[PDB]
Design a protein around this ligand. Structure first.
Ligand SMILES: Cc1cn([C@H]2C[C@H](OP(=O)(O)O)[C@@H](COP(=O)(O)O)O2)c(=O)[nH]c1=O
Ligand SMILES: [Ca+2]
Length: 136
C-alpha cells in the first residue's frame, strides 16, 4: 500500500503539472495516469480545454488547506526530473477530479505505476457517458 506525504503548494503550472515543496525541496510534479490538454508546447498549440484544465487544477490546489502527494510503486521521476504522483487536495485526488470532470484522459500507464488505474478508468467512462468537456 501507498502512503500520502504532506507537501506545500509553490505554484500550479497547468492542468497536470504543479510545483510543490516536498521534504523541504522545490520539485515539479506530473500527475500520474492522466493527460490534460496542452497549453505551452508550440507542437500542439493551446489545445481545447487546456485553459479549463489548468484553471481547474489551480483552483483545486490553491484553495486547499492540505496538499498530499502519494508516490506509486514504480519509478518516481520521469526523464525530465518531474515527480510522478497522485496529488490530493483536502483528501480529494486531483488526478481523479480532472478525469471525472472530463478535463483529462487516462494516459501513460507507465513503468509499474498503475495502482489507481481502474479507479480512474471508471471515472473516465462516467465523464464519457455524460459527454462532459473533452467528451462533448
Ligand atoms: C504521466 C507520465 C508522463 N511521462 C512523460 C511521457 C511524455 O514524454 P515525452 O515528452 O517524450 O512525450 C511526457 C508527457 O507529459 P506531458 O503531458 O507533460 O507532456 O512525459 C512519463 O514519462 N511518465 C509518466 O507517468
Ligand atoms: Ca499534458
Amino acid at each position: 500500500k501507498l502512503h500520502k506525504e504532506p507537501a506545500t503548494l509553490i505554484k500550479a503550472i497547468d492542468g497536470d503539472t504543479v510545483k510543490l515543496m516536498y521534504k523541504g525541496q522545490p520539485m515539479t510534479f506530473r500527475l500520474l495516469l492522466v493527460d490534460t490538454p496542452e497549453t505551452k508546447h508550440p507542437k500542439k498549440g493551446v489545445e481545447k480545454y487546456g485553459p479549463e484544465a489548468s484553471a481547474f487544477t489551480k483552483k483545486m490546489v490553491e484553495n486547499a488547506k492540505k496538499i498530499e502527494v502519494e508516490f506509486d510503486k514504480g519509478q518516481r521521476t520521469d526523464k525530465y526530473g518531474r515527480g510522478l504522483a497522485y496529488i490530493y487536495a483536502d483528501g480529494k485526488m486531483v488526478n481523479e477530479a480532472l478525469v471525472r470532470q472530463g478535463l483529462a484522459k487516462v494516459a501513460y500507464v507507465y513503468k509499474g505505476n498503475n495502482t489507481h488505474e481502474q479507479h480512474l478508468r471508471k471515472s473516465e467512462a462516467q465523464a464519457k457517458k455524460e459527454k462532459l468537456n473533452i467528451w462533448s
